[PDB]
């Protein structure tokens, strides 16, 4: 007989989030130290992330079943709708932002209504891309460069960076890179001429790529092959999510200098402590860095695992404190729709929770967002040049 | 006994849209030539435009009452949710995009799901700001300038413009203007010095303001007073919505050259034909340019009027063709929620409609959007320098 039931809404592209979600629940149900006498059960629904009404409808159906919390892994398009639904129903909403096609994340810029209590906790850290890239270009004493971004990137994400470089009098070009690079560059040679080409080549000597790894790979290869860059060029690629396979391929395809900036996770070193966090045992497929799955995990997958860990500890604490409120079957858009009476106290318990997991430490600040993040800085073989985090800033000279 | 009932959802800031909506219905119900034996009735609801679940909920309640079409005047935050609801319920959705606080419009960038038929018709024309401003800077042979934007503007709206000026090798600075200008500029003098000040003054010799009129007025006054600009400066202000009072105040507060770019509406000249479109008589408060109300109308107000005119003609045609489908009471998020069976044919009738109204001609292209728009270009007293539209382009040399 289950009294612990959670709901999950996933974008159709988030099959790996669903896999890790289910594995996390499995791991916790094997853990005798957390929720000693209660199993966690769940209901999952996949939706078209670009259909906010579908998102709301299917979230509402989960709330009718009865849930303690709603986990979502979805993009910005439906995020606002789910956040506002959660606010109306007092269902704690653990929101894991997914980027589109591996493009670098930008804030959802949601301007969600602040009249009502906010039932959404943002599991992924704030987007710090603009801060990190400013620090790195400053260290390299750049004065003139071009920013290339892919067709999915939201340039509001660099608006602060653009303001700052302008204030400092720099010569910064923007350019969207079409999903089809060959046409873009082929068109370029046909239309331009020697004096113009030399100018473009000069512009390409310093660039920043704000794009998904696949497009960057293709983009680098095409300019290298067409000799638009040479051994003196220096490109910076920045994206929270670039895996080791991507890094090696980027280095392999590029000539000259490459700097790679990606998110990193501060997890224990010892083999023993790798698949353990205290007495919680993690399935080897997620924590062993020799496992093929673990190496192929998306960043959102790591946050989903830790989210389930955090929820389980919150439910445990609520039971231990003898302040349990039973789940309720809710209804959306009905004459007597009413919020979950247990919601406010559950939200507060979750909000002050903290766990050690696959991402490092997951916790929430007063603004309802995870504050913890670390970036590593690689440089061309390839080696680790430094680290960045929003607290201590840049460590290790570049 | 009414068989013609429409619904409207308005942002809390859209009281004038509601007023003009009601006046339009009144005007049509007085018109014996359109809907000769049927009165139009309606239900209006105001919502927090930043609360997409509230928007959906209240739209759903209107659909439960029974409506032939849904008119909305709202910002991008809830637009996606209402569009996807309309798609699910097959309710024709006449969407009038409102900008926040008079900031220049940018596309909602909605990436709304295209698997399903699109029941939304976009009443306002596409955002052409980026096209117009490119043409004007080219005519002035600008090579170096700064773009100032207000705190609400979505810079994705100029991403194409930024790409183009980069391609042409221009030196273009960006800067957000905080809602509080004095602090921004006061901070500036305290921190900077003669060599830096001369450089900033030089940067301010050519600027584009992408902001609401109120902030522009304040911004111009503060730089003029602090002598950061002089008689040789040349600023361009661009916004669909700048009324005559705003224009005069802008000119009055500015020194040097000012170019103002705003939307204009090609309506008849003759006094008689001003408050008439064929045999349809328009209330004098909306069409007489000597009336105080008409002079204070927002752009969205004009589109709301024409939208009601267009819907009435569509209903008329549907009746005349003997293809009427009665409204139905629909339910959202229920076990047997079903779309309106009359929706597909009503959508198609509306989509191919066209009326002469307060905006000029309102009609829809194959993409479901109004294609018609005209910009006028004013220049400093003040006079009309030229016109722009996406068909014939720029007319009258600047
Ligand atoms: Ca369902
Ligand atoms: Ca910040
Ligand atoms: Ca209501
Ligand atoms: Ca275009």
From Swiss-Prot, chains A, B:
The record marks 53 as: Essential for dimerization. It is found in: Postsynaptic cell membrane. Glycans are attached at residues 270, 395. Residues 1-322 are annotated as: Interaction with CBLN1 homotrimer. Changing residue 320 to A: No effect on CBLN1 interaction. No effect on CBLN1 binding. No effect on synapse assembly. No effect on cerebellar parallel fiber-Purkinje cell synapse formation. Residues 1-398 are extracellular. Changing residue 321 to A: No effect on CBLN1 interaction. Disulfide bonds join 60-332, 76-108, 275-287. Changing residue 1 to A: Reduces binding to CBLN1. Abolishes CBLN1 binding. Abolishes synapse assembly. Abolishes cerebellar parallel fiber-Purkinje cell synapse formation. Abolishes D-Serine-dependent long term synaptic depression at PF-PC synapses. Changing residue 38 to A: Reduces binding to CBLN1. Abolishes CBLN1 binding. Abolishes synapse assembly. Abolishes cerebellar parallel fiber-Purkinje cell synapse formation. Abolishes D-Serine-dependent long term synaptic depression at PF-PC synapses. It comes from the Eukaryota. It is linked to Spinocerebellar ataxia, autosomal recessive, 18: A form of spinocerebellar ataxia, a clinically and genetically heterogeneous group of cerebellar disorders. Patients show progressive incoordination of gait and often poor coordination of hands, speech and eye movements, due to degeneration of the cerebellum with variable involvement of the brainstem and spinal cord. SCAR18 features include progressive cerebellar atrophy, delayed psychomotor development, severely impaired gait, ocular movement abnormalities, and intellectual disability. Member of the ionotropic glutamate receptor family, which plays a crucial role in synaptic organization and signal transduction in the central nervous system. Although it shares structural features with ionotropic glutamate receptors, does not bind glutamate as a primary ligand. Promotes synaptogenesis and mediates the D-Serine-dependent long term depression signals and AMPA receptor endocytosis of cerebellar parallel fiber-Purkinje cell (PF-PC) synapses through the NRX1B-CBLN1-GRID2 triad complex. The PDZ-binding motif mediates interaction with GOPC. Tetramer; dimer of dimers. Interacts with EML2, MAGI2 (via PDZ domains) and AP4M1. Interacts with BECN1, GOPC, GRID2IP, SHANK1 and SHANK2. Interacts with CBLN2, but not with CBLN4. Interacts with CBLN1 (via C1q domain); the interaction is CBLN1-NRX1 complex formation-dependent; CBLN1-binding is calcium-independent; CBLN1 hexamers anchor GRID2 N-terminal domain dimers to monomeric NRXN1 isoform beta; promotes synaptogenesis and mediates the D-Serine-dependent long term depression signals and AMPA receptor endocytosis. Belongs to the glutamate-gated ion channel (TC 1.A.10.1) family. GRID2 subfamily. This is Glutamate receptor ionotropic, delta-2. It comes from Homo sapiens. The chain holds residues 24 to 429 of 1007 of the full protein.
């Amino acid at each position: 007989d289950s009294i612990i039931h959670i709901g999950a809404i996933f974008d159709e592209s988030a099959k790996k989030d669903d896999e890790v979600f289910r594995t996390a629940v499995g791991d916790l149900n094997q853990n005798e130290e957390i929720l000693q006498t209660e199993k966690i059960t769940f209901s999952v629904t996949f939706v078209d992330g670009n259909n906010p009404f579908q998102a709301v409808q299917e979230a509402c159906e989960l709330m009718n079943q009865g849930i303690l919390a709603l986990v979502s892994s979805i993009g910005c398009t439906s995020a606002g709708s789910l956040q506002s639904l959660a606010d109306a129903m007092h269902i704690p909403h653990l929101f894991i932002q997914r980027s589109t096609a591996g493009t670098p994340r930008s804030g959802c810029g949601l301007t969600r209504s602040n009249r009502n209590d906010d039932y959404t906790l943002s599991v992924r850290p704030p987007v710090y891309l603009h801060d990190v890239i400013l620090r790195v270009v400053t260290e390299y004493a750049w004065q003139k460069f071009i920013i290339f971004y892919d067709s999915e990137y939201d340039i509001r994400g660099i608006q602060e960076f653009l303001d700052k470089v302008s204030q400092q009098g720099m010569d910064v070009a923007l350019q969207k890179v079409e999903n089809n690079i060959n046409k873009m560059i082929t068109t370029l040679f046909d239309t331009m001429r020697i004096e113009e080409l030399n100018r473009y080549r000069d512009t390409l000597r310093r660039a920043i790529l704000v794009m998904n790894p696949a497009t960057a790979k293709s983009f680098i290869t095409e300019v290298v092959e067409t000799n638009l860059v040479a051994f003196d060029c220096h490109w910076i690629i920045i994206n929270e999510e670039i895996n080791d396979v991507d890094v090696q391929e980027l280095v392999r395809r590029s000539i000259g200098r490459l700097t790679i900036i990606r998110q990193t996770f501060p997890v224990p070193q010892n083999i023993s402590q790798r698949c353990f966090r205290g007495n919680h045992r993690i399935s080897s497929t997620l924590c062993d860095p020799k496992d093929p799955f673990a190496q192929n995990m998306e960043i959102s997958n790591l946050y989903i695992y830790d989210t389930v860990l955090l929820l389980a500890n919150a439910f445990h604490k609520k039971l231990e404190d003898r302040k349990w409120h039973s789940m309720a079957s809710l209804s959306c858009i009905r004459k007597n729709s009413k919020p979950w009476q247990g919601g406010r106290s559950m939200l507060e318990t979750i909000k002050k929770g903290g766990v050690s997991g696959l991402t490092g430490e997951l916790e929430f600040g007063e603004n309802g967002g995870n504050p913890n993040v670390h970036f590593e800085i690689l440089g061309t073989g390839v080696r680790k040049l430094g680290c960045w985090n929003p607290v201590t800033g840049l460590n290790g000279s570049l």
